[PDB]
Amino acid sequence: GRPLAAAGIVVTGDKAVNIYTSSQTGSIIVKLLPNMPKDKEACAKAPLEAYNRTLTTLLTPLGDSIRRINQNAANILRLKESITATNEAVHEVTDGLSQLAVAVGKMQQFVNDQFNNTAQELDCIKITQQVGVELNLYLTELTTVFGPQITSPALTQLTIQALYNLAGGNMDYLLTKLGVGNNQLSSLIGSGLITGNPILYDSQTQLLGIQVTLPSVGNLNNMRATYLETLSVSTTKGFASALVPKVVTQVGSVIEELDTSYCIETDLDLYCTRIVTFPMSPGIYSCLNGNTSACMYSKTEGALTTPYMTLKGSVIANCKMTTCRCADPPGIISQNYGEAVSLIDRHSCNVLSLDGITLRLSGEFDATYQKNISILDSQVIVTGNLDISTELGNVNNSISNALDKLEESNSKLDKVNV
Amino acid sequence: GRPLAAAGIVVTGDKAVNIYTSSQTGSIIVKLLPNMPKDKEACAKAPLEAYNRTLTTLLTPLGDSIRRINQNAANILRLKESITATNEAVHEVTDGLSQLAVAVGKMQQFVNDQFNNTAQELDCIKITQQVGVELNLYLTELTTVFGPQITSPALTQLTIQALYNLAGGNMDYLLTKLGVGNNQLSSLIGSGLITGNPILYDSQTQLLGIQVTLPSVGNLNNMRATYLETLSVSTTKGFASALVPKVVTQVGSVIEELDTSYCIETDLDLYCTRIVTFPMSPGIYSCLNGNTSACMYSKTEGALTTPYMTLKGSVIANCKMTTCRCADPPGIISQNYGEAVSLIDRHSCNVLSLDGITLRLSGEFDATYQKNISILDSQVIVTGNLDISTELGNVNNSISNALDKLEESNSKLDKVNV
Amino acid sequence: GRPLAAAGIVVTGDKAVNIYTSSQTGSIIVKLLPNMPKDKEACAKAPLEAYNRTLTTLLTPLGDSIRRINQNAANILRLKESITATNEAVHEVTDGLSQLAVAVGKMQQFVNDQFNNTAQELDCIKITQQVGVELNLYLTELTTVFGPQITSPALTQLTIQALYNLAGGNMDYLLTKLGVGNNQLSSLIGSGLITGNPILYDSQTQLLGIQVTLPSVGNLNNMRATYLETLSVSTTKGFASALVPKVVTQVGSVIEELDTSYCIETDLDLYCTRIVTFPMSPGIYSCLNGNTSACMYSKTEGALTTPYMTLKGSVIANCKMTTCRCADPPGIISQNYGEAVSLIDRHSCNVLSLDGITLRLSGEFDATYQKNISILDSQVIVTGNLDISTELGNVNNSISNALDKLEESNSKLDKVNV
Ligand SMILES: *[C@@H]1O[C@H](CO)[C@@H](O[C@@H]2O[C@H](CO)[C@@H](O)[C@H](O)[C@H]2NC(C)=O)[C@H](O)[C@H]1NC(C)=O
Ligand SMILES: *[C@@H]1O[C@H](CO)[C@@H](O[C@@H]2O[C@H](CO)[C@@H](O)[C@H](O)[C@H]2NC(C)=O)[C@H](O)[C@H]1NC(C)=O
Numbered sequence A, B, C: 001g002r003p004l005a006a007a008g009i010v011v012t013g014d015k016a017v018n019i020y021t022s023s024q025t026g027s028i029i030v031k032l033l034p035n036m037p038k039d040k041e042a043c044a045k046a047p048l049e050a051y052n053r054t055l056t057t058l059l060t061p062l063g064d065s066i067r068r069i070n071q072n073a074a075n076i077l078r079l080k081e082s083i084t085a086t087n088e089a090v091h092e093v094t095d096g097l098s099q100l101a102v103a104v105g106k107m108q109q110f111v112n113d114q115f116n117n118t119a120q121e122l123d124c125i126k127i128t129q130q131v132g133v134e135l136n137l138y139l140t141e142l143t144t145v146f147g148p149q150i151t152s153p154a155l156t157q158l159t160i161q162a163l164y165n166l167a168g169g170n171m172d173y174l175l176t177k178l179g180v181g182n183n184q185l186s187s188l189i190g191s192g193l194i195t196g197n198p199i200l201y202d203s204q205t206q207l208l209g210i211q212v213t214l215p216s217v218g219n220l221n222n223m224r225a226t227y228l229e230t231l232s233v234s235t236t237k238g239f240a241s242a243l244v245p246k247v248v249t250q251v252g253s254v255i256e257e258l259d260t261s262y263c264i265e266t267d268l269d270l271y272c273t274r275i276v277t278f279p280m281s282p283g284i285y286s287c288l289n290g291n292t293s294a295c296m297y298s299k300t301e302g303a304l305t306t307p308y309m310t311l312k313g314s315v316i317a318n319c320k321m322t323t324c325r326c327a328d329p330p331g332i333i334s335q336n337y338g339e340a341v342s343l344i345d346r347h348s349c350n351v352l353s354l355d356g357i358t359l360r361l362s363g364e365f366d367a368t369y370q371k372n373i374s375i376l377d378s379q380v381i382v383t384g385n386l387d388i389s390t391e392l393g394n395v396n397n398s399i400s401n402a403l404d405k406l407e408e409s410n411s412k413l414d415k416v417n418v
């Protein structure tokens, strides 16, 4: 209840009681080498060759710690020597063309077998690239999901992902088989009852095997363990402390001291191997129900003992035995006689100064973790800036003048008599 | 032994005793920047520039927390003007060829200095690629081997790989120097005695220094600590519990209670700073040897105390004070009078329901962790599909007709008289 | 002091006293997807597509555990049929040129639109490459900085980097707000008071949210807790042990026993929720000040109790009740009567053998962790080795002979009469 805080007794903890047993075994088999494409191309043989190599460099130590555990007549002749020499000049132009047509034809299948020789080059780079990145993502994924197991041979608390994969996704089913509620997983994992340890590792196949161990818990209703602490308050004796156990468990109208030696405690759940309770004095039970007039006090204390304590980011102090100075909101703190002890939290004070120390009962820290990616523009020297049109045009035009200069020639024959 | 389980006393733990001391220091110096090729090419300057940058973004915080701690006469003339104009048409075809031969020659050293300009491009990409992947593998390798040390300044349990590297591979030698057996490494690492902490980090060289601390253990034979717990069994008094210590150590015929406050316990090994034993009542020693008739009982118990407990995934319960209902294999469970307490495990029951809770004494979970890699086929627009043969052929053929049309011309002169 | 070691009492621990409270909350919001370049190019859509995919495959499990919690006349005619056929041979050479000039022009815009088609290909690969590597560095960076939080839903000890980012770099300011000194951070983080747990995760935006919890500590000067242990030394009784508490706290001239149940201990700092001290016998206080003649002894011990213990990599043993054999430096060890107990460390012995075990008080292990990167030289088939100069030259030269063979023709006409 609450009136028990009128005798220096304050409830610090309140959690449910559970009984567990490590009677659930599993076996997660991890395939270090991902499933390569059906194409089976040896173009990704480069990124993988290095990936598989960094696996042996990373797993061997782990596997090691397991394996060991007339006058005109001269003109008619001159004309002959003129056209017999003209044909001599045409036969050469023909050789220059019949050999240049080869220099162009030879250059055809060249640039063709060089662009087609690049079509298979760039094709490989894109594949190698994708694989190189996709393969790195996996190695940085395993060292996160199964890090704890890779980094140590002995039992290590599993990873959510590792467990998520174990249940095959269907989590609500896994929990039910163990007897765990939805609002109890956070504490279940944070208890070290979900451990795992490597068992068999193959260097060749790169296939890691892990042995999982899960607990079977049985919740106990109507039974809740309560943690109790006490401060110093003046009484009939004078400056004494209330006498109450540290941990108690209640069922209906039965209250007894709980031995937390057989149990693993959390923030809101206690998983116990066994339950051992002890009978408490009748004067104690009477008090814990509300009868504050039943609690016994004693001077079991020294001079260096503190008149306060910490509870859930708060400070519970006796402000009549110590001046509670509230800094941020100026003024001295106190409480009605109904409560022998004052509770100071964030709702009434941000900075407090007690006898000796100065605790800060408030604070806020908001930060952002991001990354600014900047890519460099590597100017590629490769450019398509070949301008041979100035020469090409002078040909498409020079040919025109060669055709008409011939037309005049061929038309000068239309005027020949005989 | 086993007959002690006839008085409600059950052996839960059984481990060897060890004496240890943190008198072994080491120093692992990690080279964050790998050994670059002797070629010293500045083609891998891109992947490294970013890698070295993410190291300072990842290590600075760590280093920070350390730095601060006639009528025919007209024909003879007409023929002249016919061939003087024909040569006029040949001189132009020559200019068109002598300028096209340049347009082709200029295009030669172009595509040549563009394919050769690509031969050094693709060459760089392949290098950059390999480095980019190889360098990522290392960063995802260090955050796994030396993660614990990078993530925290204070002492942190080393990684198998970190230790494996420390011993230089030869592990059997390292253990011998510390006095550790082969079948004792699993517990040795899982004790937190193999810790390490960063000491000196250089931002420039990217060279991390870690201080290792190893224990020197001395095994004690003939001495084994045994953990003992007790349940409630009806006796001369009626509904009482046997009185026996929690931890005891035996040597030959000497049995005494062991103080486990100076020791770190494991699954099968206890590493102790010291050994403190206490003498136990003669009535106790007599019992632990086999004389069950010597053990004393007492009603040190409450009403909320459990009539059972958990042991190695099993449930040891008194099935005469509580109805043990076996679910999976229907039927009530009990045991011969020879054993006051019943042991229920997987070999006799898969699901049990006791007074209050229902524990599951069996379960199997097999899962597989893999990754399906699928690469995309980026169709490269670059193709070698230049078909200039239709035009090329029309030349290799048109030249033939130009050669024979000239042969007729040159043969029409063989029939000239003078 | 030191004279207390003349009664078998040795100081093992010496740390400062602190009062803490979890009254400091923070919220680190992590942007899983980095800030892409302003260019917004879809050329990095490949590496990111896979990166974002491995995030959902890595975070969903985490988010899941939160969402649910004449005769010559014949000659004048023969000459006509000679040049009319010669022009017939020139008109064809013209067609072969006017069609080859097209085969070259068509090949111009081809290799041009294939090199320019590659200029945008290589450009993309370089971008994709840089992004692929830069993006991998981030995923291997987060699984290290926020690994503990990604791997578990419940509270987990933060990472230096995570905290460094929280304080926005300015660390000296953060500590001051909590009341932590510079030479106290190592112990502060290694206490589990700097915890954090995921609270909200968005699958779409890939934005992780973590709730941070920091303590507010108030140092206590003039007060230092001291850990005390005792060995067996012969006295008036004979073979007994000194009687002194395990932990004590002193303030000025006030010495009392300290209850370390409310406190978290470290290597040099104790962070306590509260301080509970107990009064000790006057005979005890007198001794701890120096009056060794005031300490009481008792035979509270068994036969299996050890005559030694471990302290900071050393062994404190009674070398008059046990023969201390120093191995490395041969000889038996002992100490002046002034000190009832001998302290054996590295400064006086490297290997020791006591009654039962043989501890090694010295050792050094230096190792180096590095990586040798070797890149492969993938010979690119793409080469610029087109040598069409042998054919090109035969044209540039054949044209010369065609020009002069025509010059003779055109000069044979200069000798024509009419
Ligand atoms: C990954 O690399 C390791 C490197 O050791 C390879 O291990 C070899 O496995 C073959 C069989 O596949 C054995 O015959 C060899 O003895 C191993 N190498 C040596 C010399 O130890 C392994 O093959 C690689 N995995 C794959 C499938 O690529
Ligand atoms: C990364 O880039 C972002 C976006 O440009 C930067 O965001 C800035 O944040 C600061 C506060 O920390 C603001 O004052 C600026 O206005 C923001 N800039 C803009 C234009 O958005 C951020 O500074 C960069 N991160 C670092 C530290 O390099």
Ligand SMILES: *[C@@H]1O[C@H](CO)[C@@H](O[C@@H]2O[C@H](CO)[C@@H](O)[C@H](O)[C@H]2NC(C)=O)[C@H](O)[C@H]1NC(C)=O
Binding pocket: B052, B053, B056, B203, B204, B205, B206
């Ligand atoms: C890795 O990157 C860091 C970024 O800080 C580099 O640090 C520089 O180191 C040089 C000496 O090599 C110093 O002169 C500079 O002051 C440092 N940079 C600054 C401005 O802090 C470091 O050089 C890089 N490492 C290598 C070898 O590439």
Ligand SMILES: *[C@@H]1O[C@H](CO)[C@@H](O[C@@H]2O[C@H](CO)[C@@H](O)[C@H](O)[C@H]2NC(C)=O)[C@H](O)[C@H]1NC(C)=O
Binding pocket: A035, B371, B372
């Ligand atoms: C990845 O690919 C593998 C191989 O194709 C898939 O394996 C399937 O596994 C399921 C059971 O989980 C079987 O029912 C199928 O027959 C398997 N397929 C084949 C053809 O082998 C697997 O499903 C894929 N992983 C996921 C979940 O995407």
Ligand SMILES: *[C@@H]1O[C@H](CO)[C@@H](O[C@@H]2O[C@H](CO)[C@@H](O)[C@H](O)[C@H]2NC(C)=O)[C@H](O)[C@H]1NC(C)=O
Binding pocket: C052, C053, C056, C203, C204, C205, C206
């Ligand atoms: C990263 O990948 C996830 C894969 O689930 C994407 O999730 C989708 O988010 C869109 C909105 O952006 C939803 O409409 C879809 O329903 C989600 N996919 C499905 C089918 O679950 C997410 O968009 C990706 N992130 C980015 C920004 O690329």
Ligand SMILES: *[C@@H]1O[C@H](CO)[C@@H](O[C@@H]2O[C@H](CO)[C@@H](O)[C@H](O)[C@H]2NC(C)=O)[C@H](O)[C@H]1NC(C)=O
Binding pocket: B035, C371, C372
């Ligand atoms: C990686 O390369 C380095 C540098 O070559 C090697 O360094 C050698 O280290 C050993 C001792 O471990 C020396 O004996 C050699 O002289 C060193 N070699 C040289 C030339 O420096 C190292 O061996 C390589 N690492 C491994 C194990 O492959």
